[PDB]
Amino acid sequence: SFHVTWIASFYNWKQNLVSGWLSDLQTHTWDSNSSTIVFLWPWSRGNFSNEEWKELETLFRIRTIRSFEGIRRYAHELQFEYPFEIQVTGGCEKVSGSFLQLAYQGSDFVSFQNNSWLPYPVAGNMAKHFCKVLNQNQHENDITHNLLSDTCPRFILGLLDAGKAHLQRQVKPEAWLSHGPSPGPGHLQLVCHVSGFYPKPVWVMWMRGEQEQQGTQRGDILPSADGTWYLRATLEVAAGEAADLSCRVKHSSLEGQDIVLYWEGSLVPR
Amino acid sequence: AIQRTPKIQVYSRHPAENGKSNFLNCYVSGFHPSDIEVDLLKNGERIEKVEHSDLSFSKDWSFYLLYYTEFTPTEKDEYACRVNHVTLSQPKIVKWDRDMGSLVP
Ligand SMILES: CCCCCCCCCCCCCCCCCCCCCCCC(=O)N[C@@H](CO[C@@H]1O[C@H](CO)[C@@H](O[C@@H]2O[C@H](CO)[C@H](O)[C@H](O)[C@H]2O)[C@H](O)[C@H]1O)[C@H](O)CCCCCCCCCCCCCCC
Ligand SMILES: *[C@@H]1O[C@H](CO)[C@@H](O)[C@H](O)[C@H]1NC(C)=O
């Protein structure tokens, strides 16, 4: 799934952000001064020639700043009240699935379907009046359609091919154990940290021997700036039963050689 | 009503080892509107050079940001993340949890 996101915050203090994404991985940014498309990796160009890239830059210029101006010119009659934020996400995926959705104040507001903008029902007549503005040029809607059903599939195809090496790399996790901060009385919180792995799918469990401890509470998977991932898995146990416990990590990159760490040494303490 | 309060999670890139360079992270997510102020603190004092990722949002339109800095911990230093947002009565402070050791000689 490649998509472009647009974040526009209005205070009439302002802010305009455009960036491109392969799911979790950022691949493009729009520099708000050079009006250029900055490529965050060598392979961010996909198989798109430099001149087709200047074409794309032309259209990102014109539509980003006509969209900001249009939003601010119509805000009165649309009853957009300051401060407010507009968010847009558009791109393509199954098989050739495409999408373009717009939110106002963090809620579904309008979306683009085939050839025209449609309001989400719950968003009311305000969203309906917005579609009128959004639908004032059928040709501009036809351009949007072709951006979604033509340009985006070809781009994502070239992008995935160009980036296959980076996207399918295997980075081994490291792990470590610590005491968790808020155990109940008479209990300990054992924490198993897993960091530096890629790609995202991972397995981590506290164990007693070969028995998985179902009390294991996995946290969110969190990002690092270097593009790898982080996870904390905790287990609450009675202080008497923390001996034979270990943390076991399985990951594609380890090829069956699980990381296994043992609650012990000064962690008991012996 | 339409506002969402930030979740704040603090973690290190590598295990804490005194005198070895490391990276401290503060992941702020699930908030709306996007205006937010995030500081990394060392012994209660703001750390001058901190970076963050480009602002993004999830499927449910809530925003998220990663803040991080390179640092070298010693056994005496405490680190934290301090977040202020319209949803918060007062800045919320989440500490970096590390063991440190030497519970008693
Ligand atoms: C950094 C990442 C880079 C990596 C990318 C790599 C490859 C990615 C490729 C594909 C990936 C997915 C692509 C996503 C698709 C992009 C989303 C769509 C972009 C915006 C859509 C349209 C924007 C726009 O154009 N709004 C213009 C419309 O204009 C109007 O139109 C009419 C004609 O023209 C005129 O009416 C005329 O008036 C006269 C008098 O009445 C007569 O009556 C005429 O008869 C009558 O026609 C109007 O004047 C004129 O205003 C307006 O300003 C504004 C509307 C306000 C909001 C605009 C859209 C909302 C925001 C959508 C996204 C914004 C930016 C996203 C990224 C570009
Ligand atoms: C880029 O390469 C991909 C390979 O998956 C191809 O499908 C796509 O059409 C190409 N795009 C071009 C040549 O613009």
In DSSP notation, A211-267 reads EE-TT-EE---EE-TTS-EEEEEEEEEEGGG-SSEEEEEE-GGGTT--EEEES-GGG
Residues A84 and A196 in one domain: no
Chain B: residue whose CA lies nearest to A6? B56
Residue A26 belongs to a domain with what CATH number? 3.30.500.10
Cα-only R_g, chain A: 25
- CA-to-CA distance for B9 and A232, rounded, in angstroms? 11
- CA-to-CA distance for A181 and A179, rounded, in angstroms? 7
Query: Out of B32, B35, B56, whose CB is closest to A106?
Result: B32
CB contact, 8 Å: B22 with chain A? no
Q: Give the burial class of B79: count Cβ atoms within 10 A of its Cβ; 0-12 exposed, 13-18 middle, 19 or more buried.
A: buried
What technique determined this structure? X-ray
Domain assignment of residue A11, given as a range = 2-167
Instruction: Sort strands B56-57 and B63-71 into parallel, antiparallel or unpaired.
Output: antiparallel
Instruction: Please identify which residue in the block is written with the tokens 């039963």.
Output: A241
Residue A249 belongs to a domain with what CATH number? 2.60.40.10
- CA-to-CA distance for A262 and B84, rounded, in angstroms? 39
Residues A6 and A98 in one domain: yes
Q: Is A64 annotated as a binding residue?
A: yes
Residues A197 and A219 in one domain: yes
Query: Chain A: nearest CA to B45, how far in angstroms?
Result: 22
Residues A45 and A143 in one domain: yes
- CA-to-CA distance for A142 and A131, rounded, in angstroms? 15
Residues A149 and A217 in one domain: no
Residues A219 and A109 in one domain: no
HEC string of A10-71 equals ECCCEEEEEEEEECCEEEEEEECCCCEEEECCHHHHCCCCHHHHHHHHHHHHHHHHHHHHHH
Instruction: Name, in order, each residue with C-beta under 8 angstroms of B86's C-beta and a sequence gap of 6 or more.
Output: B3, B33, B35
Instruction: Sort strands A259-262 and A245-250 into parallel, antiparallel or unpaired.
Output: antiparallel
Query: Out of B54, B66, B97, whose CB is closest to A19?
Result: B54
- Measured in Å, residue A67 CA sits from the centre of ligand 1 at 6
Mutate to test the pocket of ligand 2, among A47, A52, A164, A167 (most ligand atoms within 8 A of CB): A47
Residue A155 φ then ψ, to 5°: -65, -45
Mutate to test the pocket of ligand 1, among A33, A71, A140 (most ligand atoms within 8 A of CB): A140
Residues A112 and A224 in one domain: no
Query: Out of B4, B56, B99, whose CB is closest to A178?
Result: B99
Q: Kindly list the domain boundaries of chain B, sorted by start residue.
A: 2-105
Instruction: Sort strands A14-22 and A25-31 into parallel, antiparallel or unpaired.
Output: antiparallel
C-alpha distances (whole Å) from A200 to each of A38, A63, A144, A228 are: 25, 34, 33, 8
Residues A138 and A228 in one domain: no
Of A134, A167, A200, the residue that ends a domain is A167
Chain B: residue whose CA lies nearest to A11? B35
Chain B residues touching A103 at Cβ < 8 A: 61
For the record, the structure tokens of A6 come out as 């647009």
Query: Chain A: nearest CA to B30, how far in angstroms?
Result: 11
Region for A209 from its dihedrals, namely left if φ exceeds 0, alpha if ψ lies in -120 to 50, beta otherwise: left
Chain B residues touching A87 at Cβ < 8 A: 57, 61
Nearest-CA neighbor of A245 among A233, A253, A255?
A233
Of A114, A149, A167, the residue that ends a domain is A167
For the record, the structure tokens of A194 come out as 């897993």
Task: Give the Cβ contact number of residue A239 at 10 Å.
Answer: 10
Number of domains in chain A: 2
Of A142, A167, A192, the residue that ends a domain is A167
Residues A33 and A115 in one domain: yes
Region for A57 from its dihedrals, namely left if φ exceeds 0, alpha if ψ lies in -120 to 50, beta otherwise: alpha
Quick check: B55 and A222 CB within 8 A? no
